[PDB]
Structure formats: structure tokens, C-alpha cells
Amino acid sequence: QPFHSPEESVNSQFYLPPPPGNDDPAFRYDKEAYFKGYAIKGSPRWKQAAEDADISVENIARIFSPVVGAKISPKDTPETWNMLQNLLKVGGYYATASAKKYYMRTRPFVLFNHSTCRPEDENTLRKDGSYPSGHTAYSTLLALVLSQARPERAQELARRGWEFGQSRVICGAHWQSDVDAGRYVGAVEFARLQTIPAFQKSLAKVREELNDKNNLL
Amino acid sequence: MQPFHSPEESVNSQFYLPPPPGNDDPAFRYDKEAYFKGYAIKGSPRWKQAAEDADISVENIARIFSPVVGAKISPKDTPETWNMLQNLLKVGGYYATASAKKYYMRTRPFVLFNHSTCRPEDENTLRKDGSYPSGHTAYSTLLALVLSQARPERAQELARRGWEFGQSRVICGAHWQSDVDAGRYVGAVEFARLQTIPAFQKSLAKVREELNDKNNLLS
């Protein structure tokens, strides 16, 4: 079960500013950012962006294990394995819902008629509000939670968290401003989770699994 | 009154933050355009807010956030919260941004364009301090998060006010938009580090009861 209900997340439509408009400096920048990523298409950083695009637990685990420095599997780290999925629901979905639905911002690949670095998701995304990025809110939240469980890896986690969000831009699924907003959303939800007992309980166990000598790499 | 942790205990900002935008970088073009959009509203109500937001003295920070968190913040009524406000400035505004600041020593916009800011009195000091990332922003974001933890039903207002506090640095001409976007992340990273420190948890507990005391509630 999720740490809290959809209604228990801080309303993102209230604290986030509206999306950059057609003539705002930020939007001119969003377009420039979009084309910079489209230009390096097919390249390695572009491929990495395609990998970061997959948010299934298996892939998140594969990506963060090296960064956090511990094996992450349903067998060795069962609580950490639920934490990753639980955080995706409340952070990527619940926390971004109201803002996303209220603005229904059009995605760049849709506006310019180009495919993304991961064509599979293109149909789902077409109908999802672009602002703010749920992927980013999730990866930011994840980075902060794991930093709390294993602070010795804080800098690596903060760094990877950031690049995971930048992958969305380069991929063509989001605008730079969607990602900038998503990061703030991730921090706000992280602060909200700290007051929920179920989370404190879960985190204690996660802290135990990731610092377990039998799980370190 | 002792920092929740030592300088060396802040996550190295120079390692996780990307470098500030270069001269021919599309993002710096955005920084300059953003700077002029702010210089343009000079004299408006929002501009007035930006000038008041510029003063980070504990007195002014208390005045600004009391209404938002919904409680009277004072050295007499809320002793622990008063210390918290100053402790966070130290570890969040300075310690958390120090290495990236020194590493890049980025020039501030009001200096670059030879303009005055919305708070002339602090220019001589800002002149010596690296611009990226924004310590003011990191502190205000951190503070909004910490207060959201002590008084969660005020989370949305605190989240909004913390965000606008950062935007005031941009409007005031003291920081580039990029210094602010970066400082927000720094404040978040520091917020996560503080959760693992005992001295913080203990101070927070007191702050929590002080801010929820029936006698300090504000409308």
C-alpha cells in the first residue's frame, strides 16, 4: 500500500509557477534545449537517456545499485525493493497529478513531430501532462531517500539523480522547465514523507539492508 | 548554538552540481533575458517584495515566514525555532554551497552590467562572493522544507513562498536564474543530509511543539 493517498500529497498546482509561455525567456530556452538533445541523437549520451527512460523497478535497481554501492534485489533487499515502487507511486504520480492535469502541457516531441529516445512510451506520454516531469520528481525523491539511508554516497546519488532528470530533456519527452519543476516537486514530497510513520518504518529497514555487509559490492 | 554539522560534513556541491552556463551557452542567453525581465519591473509590488526578501537577517526571515507557517516566531516565544533559523543559514546557506562557490567564482549580473541591485547596502559583500550557486536560495528552500516537516498542513504555502524567495534574488539582480535553480537542489540535498544528524532531529522535535503550541498560532 502507498505511504499516503493521492489527496495527502502537497498540491503541486498551488506551489509551482505556471509553465513557460510562448514568448517567455524560459520557453525560448526550452526550445533550444530540445534541439540540442535532438542533435546528439543516436550518440552514447542519447542511448543512456533511453536507458534512464525505463522506470521499471528492475531498471532503477540496476542503475542505482552501483551508485548506492549495494545489491538491490527482491531477495537481498526486499524492503528496498518495495520502497522503489512505493516512491514511484507517491512521487512520480501523486505529487505531480494536480499540476499535470491543470495545465496539460504539450510535450516537445508532439509539438515538433519527432519521435523520442524511447518510442514505446510515446503513446502513453501523448495523453499525459508534460508539466512537471513525474520521472524527475521520482528520480529526485529516490536520490534523497537513498541519501538518507546511506549518506556516505550522498554526492554520487545527488549527481546521478540530476543526470536522470536531464535524460528526459535529451530524450525529447520533456522541456527543461518540466524537469526543473519536477526536482522541486521531488524535494517537497520528500519533506512530506518524513512525517509519515509508515515511511519512517520502511526507511529504517531500508537503512538496515543497504548498510548490511552481506549486501555491499 | 553550534552548527548541526561541520563544513566537511556538507555534501560536496562542486561534485554533484553541473558547471554554470558558459558565454555562448543557450542557458546563459536565458540568464541574461531573465535578468532584464526583472530589471523591468523595478518599482512594482513584486519588486518591493524582492527587496525585503534580500535581507537574510534572522529578524527579517522570521517576519516573512511567521505568517506563512502560521505562528509567531520570536526569540522569546519560540527559542528553539529561533536557533533553528540561524543554524540552517550556517549549514544551508554557507556550508552547503561553499565548494562550488569557491570553485567557479562566478560573476554576479549587477556587476557584469554595472547596475545597482534592489539592495545597494549588500553589494560590496556580494561583490566578493561567488554567484553560483545561490546560498540565499539554498537556505530558503531548506527552511521551507524544514518548516513543512514541523507544520505539514502548511506545506503548500511554505513550498510556494520558498520558491518565490529564490525568484526574488533573480528579480533583485543579485543572481542569475541558473544560480537559483541550482541552489534549490543544494537546499534539498542538505535537507536530506540533516535528517541523518541527531542534533537536527532533537532540535526539530522542539521546533515542532513550539510551532504547534496553541499560544503561538497566527492567522
Side-chain angles (χ1 to χ4, degrees):
Chain A
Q1 213 60 59
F3 291 123
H4 60 73
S5 65
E7 312 78 59
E8 289 185 295
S9 51
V10 186
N11 181 19
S12 59
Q13 187 282 313
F14 174 101
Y15 67 73
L16 283 184
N22 200 276
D23 208 18
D24 294 317
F27 189 65
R28 300 191 169 201
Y29 174 45
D30 280 335
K31 287 186 286 181
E32 279 300 298
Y34 176 73
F35 285 112
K36 283 278 182 172
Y38 195 59
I40 62 170
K41 178 175 174 185
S43 78
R45 184 56 184 91
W46 169 275
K47 298 173 179 184
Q48 185 203 313
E51 281 166 49
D52 294 5
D54 182 33
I55 50 181
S56 63
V57 59
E58 290 61 32
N59 190 62
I60 296 304
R62 176 186 69 76
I63 292 177
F64 284 85
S65 294
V67 184
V68 79
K71 308 180 183 180
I72 300 186
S73 60
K75 177 186 178 183
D76 308 307
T77 64
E79 190 55 47
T80 301
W81 193 262
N82 293 323
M83 178 65 90
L84 300 195
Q85 305 178 71
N86 207 319
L87 288 179
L88 174 66
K89 182 79 100 178
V90 303
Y93 293 95
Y94 295 6
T96 63
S98 59
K100 271 175 175 289
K101 210 171 187 178
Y102 190 79
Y103 297 116
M104 283 306 288
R105 194 184 187 183
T106 292
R107 286 161 187 278
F109 72 95
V110 178
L111 193 65
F112 300 121
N113 267 67
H114 289 146
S115 63
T116 74
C117 79
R118 194 186 176 204
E120 305 61 298
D121 311 334
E122 275 179 46
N123 225 77
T124 299
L125 307 185
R126 276 193 188 300
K127 315 189 181 192
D128 188 58
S130 182
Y131 184 85
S133 175
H135 268 58
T136 310
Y138 174 52
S139 82
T140 295
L141 177 56
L142 202 64
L144 300 176
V145 173
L146 297 178
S147 294
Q148 184 172 20
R150 192 155 163 58
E152 322 79 46
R153 309 292 293 177
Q155 64 182 33
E156 286 73 34
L157 286 161
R159 186 165 188 164
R160 191 66 184 92
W162 183 285
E163 309 176 315
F164 190 102
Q166 284 311 109
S167 288
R168 303 306 288 149
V169 173
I170 292 167
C171 190
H174 281 292
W175 301 96
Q176 181 61 57
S177 64
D178 296 332
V179 170
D180 289 325
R183 279 164 187 155
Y184 196 62
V185 172
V188 171
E189 173 68 13
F190 175 72
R192 169 46 61 77
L193 287 174
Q194 300 302 312
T195 65
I196 301 182
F199 170 79
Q200 284 308 335
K201 184 179 188 171
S202 191
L203 184 69
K205 186 73 171 195
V206 170
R207 171 158 40 210
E208 184 183 59
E209 310 179 320
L210 307 185
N211 285 290
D212 183 336
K213 299 289 183 190
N214 291 318
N215 290 324
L216 302 191
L217 301 168
Chain B
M1 173 55 233
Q2 175 179 295
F4 288 129
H5 66 69
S6 56
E8 317 81 61
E9 277 304 296
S10 276
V11 181
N12 199 323
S13 46
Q14 188 283 310
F15 179 102
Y16 64 82
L17 285 175
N23 185 262
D24 300 308
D25 191 305
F28 185 48
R29 188 227 252 69
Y30 167 38
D31 279 335
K32 290 180 295 191
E33 284 176 45
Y35 170 88
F36 288 107
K37 289 299 170 191
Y39 195 68
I41 63 171
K42 201 165 191 173
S44 60
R46 183 62 185 84
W47 195 77
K48 177 197 178 183
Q49 173 188 180
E52 284 164 46
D53 287 347
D55 175 16
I56 57 170
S57 65
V58 64
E59 282 68 39
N60 192 50
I61 298 292
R63 186 203 74 208
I64 294 175
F65 284 95
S66 289
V68 185
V69 73
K72 288 176 179 174
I73 299 178
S74 62
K76 166 214 170 180
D77 301 299
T78 50
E80 198 52 51
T81 305
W82 192 262
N83 285 288
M84 176 67 87
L85 292 194
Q86 303 177 62
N87 220 309
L88 293 180
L89 177 55
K90 191 91 66 183
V91 308
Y94 296 114
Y95 295 173
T97 62
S99 78
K101 264 192 187 298
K102 165 196 173 178
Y103 191 79
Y104 299 106
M105 277 311 278
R106 194 190 192 180
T107 295
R108 294 180 179 264
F110 77 88
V111 167
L112 196 80
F113 296 114
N114 189 74
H115 285 176
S116 77
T117 66
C118 80
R119 189 93 182 185
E121 314 136 70
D122 300 316
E123 277 162 52
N124 260 166
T125 284
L126 303 179
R127 278 171 174 286
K128 302 171 183 173
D129 186 54
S131 186
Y132 176 97
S134 171
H136 278 44
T137 299
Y139 169 54
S140 77
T141 296
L142 181 55
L143 190 52
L145 294 176
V146 171
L147 289 177
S148 296
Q149 197 172 2
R151 188 72 177 271
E153 74 274 20
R154 309 301 303 154
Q156 59 170 37
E157 288 79 29
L158 288 164
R160 188 184 212 165
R161 191 62 184 92
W163 176 288
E164 281 309 314
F165 201 83
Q167 287 312 114
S168 289
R169 297 313 282 150
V170 177
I171 292 165
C172 188
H175 282 285
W176 300 99
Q177 178 58 51
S178 60
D179 301 332
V180 172
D181 299 317
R184 289 201 174 96
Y185 195 68
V186 174
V189 171
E190 175 62 36
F191 177 65
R193 172 48 65 74
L194 287 169
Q195 298 307 308
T196 73
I197 300 179
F200 175 69
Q201 290 306 335
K202 284 148 193 169
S203 178
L204 173 69
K206 297 169 186 180
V207 170
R208 193 180 320 162
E209 53 186 47
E210 287 188 350
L211 298 186
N212 285 283
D213 189 303
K214 194 180 182 181
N215 296 180
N216 295 306
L217 303 181
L218 194 63
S219 53

